[PDB]
Amino acid sequence: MIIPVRCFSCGKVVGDKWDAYLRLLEEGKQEGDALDELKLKRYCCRRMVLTHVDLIEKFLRYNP
Amino acid sequence: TTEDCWTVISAFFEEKGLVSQQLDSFDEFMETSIQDLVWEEPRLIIRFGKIYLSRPTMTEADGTTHAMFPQEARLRNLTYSSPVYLDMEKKVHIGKVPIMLRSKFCSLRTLDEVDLYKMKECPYDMGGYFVINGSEKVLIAQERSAANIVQVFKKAAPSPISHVAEIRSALEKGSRLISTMQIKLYGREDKGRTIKATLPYVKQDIPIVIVFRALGVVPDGEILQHICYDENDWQMLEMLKPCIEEGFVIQDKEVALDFIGEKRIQYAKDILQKELLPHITQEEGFETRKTFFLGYMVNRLLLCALERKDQDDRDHFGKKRLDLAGPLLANLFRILFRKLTREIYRYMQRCIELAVKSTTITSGLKYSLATGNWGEQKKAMSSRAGVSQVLNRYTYSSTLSHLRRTNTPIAKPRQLHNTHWGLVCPAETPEGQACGLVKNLSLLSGISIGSPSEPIINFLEEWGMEPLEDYDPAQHTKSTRIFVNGVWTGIHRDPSMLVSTMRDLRRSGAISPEVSIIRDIREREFKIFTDVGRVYRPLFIVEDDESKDNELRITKEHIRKIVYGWSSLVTSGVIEYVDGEEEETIMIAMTPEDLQLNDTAKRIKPTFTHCEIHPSMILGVAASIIPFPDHNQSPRNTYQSAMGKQAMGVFLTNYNVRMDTMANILYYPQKPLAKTQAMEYLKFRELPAGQNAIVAIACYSGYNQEDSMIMNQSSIDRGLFRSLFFRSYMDQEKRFGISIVEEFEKPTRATTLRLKHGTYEKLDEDGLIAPGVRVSGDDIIIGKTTPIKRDASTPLRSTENGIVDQVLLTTNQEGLKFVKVRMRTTKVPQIGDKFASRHGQKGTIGVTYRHEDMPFSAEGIVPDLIINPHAIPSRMTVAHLIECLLSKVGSIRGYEGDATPFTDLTVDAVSNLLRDNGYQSRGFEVMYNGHTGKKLMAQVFFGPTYYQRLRHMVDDKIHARARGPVQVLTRQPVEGRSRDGGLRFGEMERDCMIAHGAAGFLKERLMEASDAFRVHVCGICGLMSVIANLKKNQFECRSCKNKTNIYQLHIPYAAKLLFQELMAMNIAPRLYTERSGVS
Amino acid sequence: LHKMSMMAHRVKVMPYSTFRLNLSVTSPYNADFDGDEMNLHVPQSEETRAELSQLCAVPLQIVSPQSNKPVMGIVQDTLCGVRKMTLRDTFIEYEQVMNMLFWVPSWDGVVPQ
Amino acid sequence: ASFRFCLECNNMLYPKEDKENQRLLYSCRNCDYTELAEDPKVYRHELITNIGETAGIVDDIGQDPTLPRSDKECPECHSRDCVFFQSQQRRKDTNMTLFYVCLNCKKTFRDES
Amino acid sequence: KKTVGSGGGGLIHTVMREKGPKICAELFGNIQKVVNYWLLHNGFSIGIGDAIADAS
Amino acid sequence: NEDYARPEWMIITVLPVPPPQVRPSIAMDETTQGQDDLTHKLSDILKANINVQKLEM
Ligand SMILES: [Zn+2]
Ligand SMILES: [Zn+2]
Ligand SMILES: [Zn+2]
Ligand SMILES: [Zn+2]
Structure with a gap:
């Protein structure tokens, strides 16, 4: 259901990190590290993407 | 290894899928069954043959007959049923049978990925449901004590009867009579002891003796031949003595068949070929066998009546069946078809010398499935309600559960028996009322379908099986007797080889893996069950094929190999289906590994024939999502097992195209930080049921007290736990055979006035609103009228409001205007909404603070939620605390956290991994009180935990009334907040007040704040007659002719009626304003 | 099922869609906040009121006649903490000792030595 | 007889x-x-039975895996692979002694003392 | 619990009897506000660690 | 008591027919049926009376 602008817990933005992440996966095969480099330190902002379930993808396969 | 058996499990669902049973049992009715049913007791004083079942159609006026499809019938509220035709012999349309989505006759069954996506059907939808008049109807499994089996019950000290044995009989294929045989045993275990049995149509009961002579065996010792298989068992024999004397008065077959009141004797025969033990077969030349049965019964009886065998376990699940969908459509059908039988008989009884309105088979079926009343319709409610409900759609795991649900008609049944192991989930079951009478099936469990008897009957009588007919109990001492589906098809000598050959024949797959074979050595018997309705689970085979020591048949080659379905995994003898009955005589090993020094932290762990695929498979949907249920107080798990069925999330993806009443979608979902390997098969990652809240179990403002939790406003603003709420009002344009149609407009004036209160200005000229419109108060959502111009327009419920999200007009079969409206609304969490984790830790919001006010940790990190430590000690739910820890690691470590049941992970282990990352080994962190900045003298259990936002938000409950809409019959207020109703002041509330002595106040409730009414009694005949014309003063009260002595009183109108009723029952309640009886 | 299952309370209008009740009066009704709902009735006469304050007032109910003992004490947080706060090891400095007396509505207005 | x-x-x-x-x-x-x-x-x-404790013991009673294994030694072949149980007489007044049978004779020796 | 619970000797039972209904009903509000405030600053919690027994 | 209740009055001769407010109808506004349970078994009784009489003449 798309990524959440700003993390609930602390507030830090997290909109941009999406495409970046899904790439550092496909190729560079990371998790922990990718994130670390994406500047996502403390678990609070962290859990947002790693727990995000992009439903929108299946929805987009729908007509209107 | 352990991680391997998982792949095995993976292999299973890839091919069978969570709802095998449902479809499989449906197809079995369509494909085969339905035919066999119509061809049995057909022919009428003209035969019937094969039947044709075409596909879905829609015969609507203003069009030909449009080939209808599921996703449409839903929206237009129709019926996913197709035609049925049959070439009758002395072509014809006969009823519409509702297909089951995702089955075989449903076109979806073939279409592939892209193909389906084009049919608008959501791939994740496993289907398995029916679509009657819109709403998705799911048939619910109905449990029932199996038939054709030997039992024995002891009957209490106060009763002329001691013990009794019963046996329910019914033809496994053909009509299925429901007449049971009762072989009682009067005279308690003392008194000076007859034996009587009950037969269908016989007034009194008959003494076993006569029954033998009445069969064709009149002399003794040829009788004990059948009963006792050991001339040296004097005990048993003794008991019988007094009994022989009873029947000593009838010395032959004539009188035998007589005494049952030439005409009756002839009739007697009848009652032996159609009433006496009607299952087995009703042929003719088989008299002999049953005699051996009736002997084996009275035997089984005494074996208990002599304290050698306990009383039969009434709730031994193995002796219970489950009538799934397929079976139900039978016993229901017969009742119908039999009325259909005698219906076509009526048309012929009018012909003083086509007609068959094939809607009675259509509408009849509908009635049941719609309501839940099986047995026909008519003035016949004498059916069972519960069957078929309104499939849940609150959350995905909710819907799932519902299909996998079983019922059980009514202190002992409710118990959780042993037999329930493996087959049913122990936790998931409704609270209060019926609790334990509603069971859900485990993951691995499955129900039988119906294999064939003969290919094993033959296979027997062609391997050592000397027929029952000629038996000699003393000549044949240890002859191992074999039973087939509750019938005795002769005995067999040494079975050991005969046994482990059929079972190996099955493993290759030439005699269905579904049949059950149980050998009870401890009695020398062989139980054979082919039956349809037997619950079964799968197990690993061990076999000692090691000529070099003492080991599991399966290897790492079968594994990596996973034209290779699950059917082959069975066709290779690697797994067997063990039902509850067969279980009794086997020995199952738990952990495959171990069961073939230690750390003082981990949990203490305590010939093998079978192994458990994996213990975490005995759970059903509910418990399956709970992390570490083996760390919480079991009764708590049982709670979450229900609350789960009430949380918010996303229940399907097509949701944006569904016009269903009520539906909620959680703004932003979130897959849990900790999971079960089993979740991988519950597509949960693609359909989460909640979010991961940054919990912090501590005390603060004191608003997190008594199971109430504090929620960080700041993140509530950031969209945390917000949810959409849908609703769908629908209307039609009704007509009459007498050309008088309704209208869908924007009515005003026009001689009638009959209109609503709200505003219509927000109605475009099409009589509808727009999707932009901001509706509120009561505003009319649809505009309708009835010319007889009275408004019948629908107004948004006074308590609701939101925004329109999509309106749509459409035709109906009766060429009427079908129109549904859907309203959307975003629901924000509020200081009252209910929430909960997956550990029965339910709670609502007490207040909401922001970032500042909130407590925080040096790192910066701040909590989203703060629940109270007091909700832990007596709740005992510890896994919660653990789920937190684990999830606090996977967060920091980025790796997905496995929470699955009995693995090799401990709190001490996890604690070390968390120490490797930087934070406290137990989770705990320092926090500074958001108001002063000063540290907290204590430390807090700060850590991310998953939280589901269950529905039941305040604004759906909040209700207040002061003199509103009054009921009609009573004239008191009305029920429900939806109709602006009023709260009941029931007994218990009365009582209390009376204790307080609040005399007046109570008098003021019941009168001023409800009923009340001024009635005029008569001073003579204390009645409510008086014709009080409040103007011309005229009072009167004929029959007692008075107009002078009349009194006025203030009583609750509710009571006045009570009296009128009493009057109307001829009783006379005289009311006197003066005492007359004196003393 | 109690004499105390119905008691007269003073109305205090506040925002948000919920009945805000005191903690200590939880166990009489035997309620919790895991979703529980509560019914409220509204008096109507001038005498009715008196009758509500003279016989149903919460203070009169403090002592339950069935066991000649109270039926409302200090629950959860308040109880749990008062123990800590009481211990000899518990010390408080001026800065907090001030904000605490202020928080007491009944304070005699005299700082103890 | x-x-x-x-x-x-x-x-x-x-x-x-x-x-x-x-x-x-x-x-x-x-x-x-x-x-x-x-x-x-x-x-x-007989108000205090003792007959039916030996309950049908066909030689095949050694292929039923649900039975216990004892390493004693029969009164005849002197083996060390024996199975056992308690009386099958479901009588609330029976006793709880173990009767053992050996697959290489069929005796009924106990463990009592 | 023993000293401020629904018990016999109960400090509550005595203040009603000795001072009256009103004062005691008020007594609550005070004792509350005070405690909650203190706790509010002193903090308090519970976690798995409070359930583990010594190594030996 | 010869005045308030004599044994004989336990058998009914003339049957007391209760009015609308006892067995109300529930219309779907006005021009739509909606009839009580009793508003059926009354005519049924009536009919069982009528027919009876039409068998006694
Ligand atoms: Zn954050
Ligand atoms: Zn003779
Ligand atoms: Zn009169
Ligand atoms: Zn031996």
Whole structure:
């Protein structure tokens, strides 16, 4: 259901990190590290993407 | 290894899928069954043959007959049923049978990925449901004590009867009579002891003796031949003595068949070929066998009546069946078809010398499935309600559960028996009322379908099986007797080889893996069950094929190999289906590994024939999502097992195209930080049921007290736990055979006035609103009228409001205007909404603070939620605390956290991994009180935990009334907040007040704040007659002719009626304003 | 099922869609906040009121006649903490000792030595 | 024991006394047939059973995996692979001693003491 | 619990009897506000660690 | 008591027919049926009376 602008817990933005992440996966095969480099330190902002379930993808396969 | 058996499990669902049973049992009715049913007791004083079942159609006026499809019938509220035709012999349309989505006759069954996506059907939808008049109807499994089996019950000290044995009989294929045989045993275990049995149509009961002579065996010792298989068992024999004397008065077959009141004797025969033990077969030349049965019964009886065998376990699940969908459509059908039988008989009884309105088979079926009343319709409610409900759609795991649900008609049944192991989930079951009478099936469990008897009957009588007919109990001492589906098809000598050959024949797959074979050595018997309705689970085979020591048949080659379905995994003898009955005589090993020094932290762990695929498979949907249920107080798990069925999330993806009443979608979902390997098969990652809240179990403002939790406003603003709420009002344009149609407009004036209160200005000229419109108060959502111009327009419920999200007009079969409206609304969490984790830790919001006010940790990190430590000690739910820890690691470590049941992970282990990352080994962190900045003298259990936002938000409950809409019959207020109703002041509330002595106040409730009414009694005949014309003063009260002595009183109108009723029952309640009886 | 299952309370209008009740009066009704709902009735006469304050007032109910003992004490947080706060090891400095007396509505207005 | 009934009209055998000779006879009350008494015992009651504890033990009682394994040693072949249980007499007043049988003889030796 | 619970000797039972209904009903509000405030600053919690027994 | 209740009055001769407010109808506004349970078994009784009489003449 798309990524959440700003993390609930602390507030830090997290909109941009999406495409970046899904790439550092496909190729560079990371998790922990990718994130670390994406500047996502403390678990609070962290859990947002790693727990995000992009439903929108299946929805987009729908007509209107 | 352990991680391997998982792949095995993976292999299973890839091919069978969570709802095998449902479809499989449906197809079995369509494909085969339905035919066999119509061809049995057909022919009428003209035969019937094969039947044709075409596909879905829609015969609507203003069009030909449009080939209808599921996703449409839903929206237009129709019926996913197709035609049925049959070439009758002395072509014809006969009823519409509702297909089951995702089955075989449903076109979806073939279409592939892209193909389906084009049919608008959501791939994740496993289907398995029916679509009657819109709403998705799911048939619910109905449990029932199996038939054709030997039992024995002891009957209490106060009763002329001691013990009794019963046996329910019914033809496994053909009509299925429901007449049971009762072989009682009067005279308690003392008194000076007859034996009587009950037969269908016989007034009194008959003494076993006569029954033998009445069969064709009149002399003794040829009788004990059948009963006792050991001339040296004097005990048993003794008991019988007094009994022989009873029947000593009838010395032959004539009188035998007589005494049952030439005409009756002839009739007697009848009652032996159609009433006496009607299952087995009703042929003719088989008299002999049953005699051996009736002997084996009275035997089984005494074996208990002599304290050698306990009383039969009434709730031994193995002796219970489950009538799934397929079976139900039978016993229901017969009742119908039999009325259909005698219906076509009526048309012929009018012909003083086509007609068959094939809607009675259509509408009849509908009635049941719609309501839940099986047995026909008519003035016949004498059916069972519960069957078929309104499939849940609150959350995905909710819907799932519902299909996998079983019922059980009514202190002992409710118990959780042993037999329930493996087959049913122990936790998931409704609270209060019926609790334990509603069971859900485990993951691995499955129900039988119906294999064939003969290919094993033959296979027997062609391997050592000397027929029952000629038996000699003393000549044949240890002859191992074999039973087939509750019938005795002769005995067999040494079975050991005969046994482990059929079972190996099955493993290759030439005699269905579904049949059950149980050998009870401890009695020398062989139980054979082919039956349809037997619950079964799968197990690993061990076999000692090691000529070099003492080991599991399966290897790492079968594994990596996973034209290779699950059917082959069975066709290779690697797994067997063990039902509850067969279980009794086997020995199952738990952990495959171990069961073939230690750390003082981990949990203490305590010939093998079978192994458990994996213990975490005995759970059903509910418990399956709970992390570490083996760390919480079991009764708590049982709670979450229900609350789960009430949380918010996303229940399907097509949701944006569904016009269903009520539906909620959680703004932003979130897959849990900790999971079960089993979740991988519950597509949960693609359909989460909640979010991961940054919990912090501590005390603060004191608003997190008594199971109430504090929620960080700041993140509530950031969209945390917000949810959409849908609703769908629908209307039609009704007509009459007498050309008088309704209208869908924007009515005003026009001689009638009959209109609503709200505003219509927000109605475009099409009589509808727009999707932009901001509706509120009561505003009319649809505009309708009835010319007889009275408004019948629908107004948004006074308590609701939101925004329109999509309106749509459409035709109906009766060429009427079908129109549904859907309203959307975003629901924000509020200081009252209910929430909960997956550990029965339910709670609502007490207040909401922001970032500042909130407590925080040096790192910066701040909590989203703060629940109270007091909700832990007596709740005992510890896994919660653990789920937190684990999830606090996977967060920091980025790796997905496995929470699955009995693995090799401990709190001490996890604690070390968390120490490797930087934070406290137990989770705990320092926090500074958001108001002063000063540290907290204590430390807090700060850590991310998953939280589901269950529905039941305040604004759906909040209700207040002061003199509103009054009921009609009573004239008191009305029920429900939806109709602006009023709260009941029931007994218990009365009582209390009376204790307080609040005399007046109570008098003021019941009168001023409800009923009340001024009635005029008569001073003579204390009645409510008086014709009080409040103007011309005229009072009167004929029959007692008075107009002078009349009194006025203030009583609750509710009571006045009570009296009128009493009057109307001829009783006379005289009311006197003066005492007359004196003393 | 109690004499105390119905008691007269003073109305205090506040925002948000919920009945805000005191903690200590939880166990009489035997309620919790895991979703529980509560019914409220509204008096109507001038005498009715008196009758509500003279016989149903919460203070009169403090002592339950069935066991000649109270039926409302200090629950959860308040109880749990008062123990800590009481211990000899518990010390408080001026800065907090001030904000605490202020928080007491009944304070005699005299700082103890 | 294995007592008998009688030919001709196959029924139960009731006993009668051989008056003139003083001895017991058995007979039938359907015809006339009469054969002497096999044994002087006619009826037994037993209020404290002990028969049925050995309950059917076919040699195959060693392939039923649900049974325990004991390493004792029979009174004859002197082996060390024995199985056991308790009386099968479901009588609330029975006792709980273990009877052991050996697959290489079939004795009924206990563990009692 | 023993000293401020629904018990016999109960400090509550005595203040009603000795001072009256009103004062005691008020007594609550005070004792509350005070405690909650203190706790509010002193903090308090519970976690798995409070359930583990010594190594030996 | 010869005045308030004599044994004989336990058998009914003339049957007391209760009015609308006892067995109300529930219309779907006005021009739509909606009839009580009793508003059926009354005519049924009536009919069982009528027919009876039409068998006694
Ligand atoms: Zn954050
Ligand atoms: Zn009168
Ligand atoms: Zn004879
Ligand atoms: Zn031996």
